[PDB]
C-alpha cells in the first residue's frame, strides 16, 4: 500500500526522484518554463547538473514527509500551507501539482513494481484540494 510505497521510494529516493521528475518534464514540456536552467538538455545531461539532482532530491524528501504525515492519503493542512507559502512556489498554480502527480502515477503504473498507484492518484488530488484551500490559485 501507500505506507510501503513511501518506504520503497525512500530506499532509492535520489534515483526515483530524478526518474519521476524527468517523466513530469518530458510529459509536460511547457513545465520547463519554471525551470529554465533545464531547457535544451537531455535526461543524462540534467542528471549531471548539481542543482537538478540536489533540488529534485529535496523535492521528493519533502513529498515523502507530506505523504508520511497524511491520513488516508489526505495531507496535513500545515503541509499544504508550507507548500503554498514557500517563496520558490510564488509562480505556481494547482495545475503544476496536478501534472506532477499525473506523471508520478503514470510512472508507477508503467514500472515493474507493486506500487499502490490508486493511493498515489488520490494523494495527488487530495494535495491539490488542500493547496486550493490553503489559497493557491
Ligand X SMILES: CC1=CC=C(C(C)C)CC1
Report the binding-site residues for heme b: 36-37, 51, 55, 58, 88-89, 97
Asked if 13 is part of the footprint of ligand X (rule: CB under 6 A), the reply reads no
Binding pattern for the stretch 48-87 against ligand HEM, x by CB under 6 A and - elsewhere: ------xx--xx--xx--x---------------------
Backbone angles phi, psi at 42, to 5 degrees: -70, 165
* Residue from the set 8, 96, 117, 129 that interacts with ligand HEM by CB under 6 A: 96
Q: How far is CA 86 from CA 16, 48, 76, 89, 131, in A?
A: 23, 26, 16, 5, 12
Asked if 89 is part of the footprint of ligand X (rule: CB under 6 A), the reply reads no
C-alpha cell at 47: 542528471
Backbone angles phi, psi at 87, to 5 degrees: -70, -25
* Cβ neighbours around 52 below 10 Å, total: 22
* Cβ neighbours around 91 below 10 Å, total: 9
21 binds, among ligand X, ligand HEM, none (CB under 5 to 8 A by kind): ligand X
Asked if 123 is part of the footprint of ligand HEM (rule: CB under 6 A), the reply reads no
Instruction: Cell 488520490: give the residue.
Output: 122
52 binds, among ligand X, ligand HEM, none (CB under 5 to 8 A by kind): ligand X
Where do contacts with ligand HEM occur on this chain (CB under 6 A)? 31, 34-35, 54-55, 58-59, 62-63, 66, 88-89, 92, 96-97, 100
Amino acid at each position: 500500500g501507500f505506507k510501503q510505497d513511501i518506504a520503497t521510494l525512500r530506499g532509492d529516493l535520489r534515483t526515483y526522484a530524478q526518474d519521476i521528475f524527468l517523466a513530469f518534464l518530458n510529459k509536460y514540456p511547457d513545465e520547463k518554463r519554471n525551470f529554465k536552467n533545464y531547457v535544451g538538455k537531455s535526461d543524462q545531461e540534467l542528471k549531471s547538473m548539481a542543482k537538478f539532482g540536489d533540488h529534485t532530491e529535496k523535492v521528493f524528501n519533502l513529498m515523502m514527509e507530506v505523504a508520511d504525515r497524511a491520513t488516508d492519503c489526505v495531507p496535513l493542512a500545515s503541509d499544504a500551507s508550507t507548500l503554498v507559502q514557500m517563496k520558490q512556489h510564488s509562480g505556481l498554480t494547482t495545475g503544476n501539482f496536478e501534472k506532477l502527480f499525473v506523471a508520478l502515477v503514470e510512472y508507477m503504473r508503467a514500472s515493474g513494481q507493486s506500487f499502490d498507484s490508486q493511493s498515489w492518484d488520490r494523494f495527488g488530488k487530495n494535495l491539490v484540494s488542500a493547496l486550493s484551500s490553503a489559497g493557491m490559485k
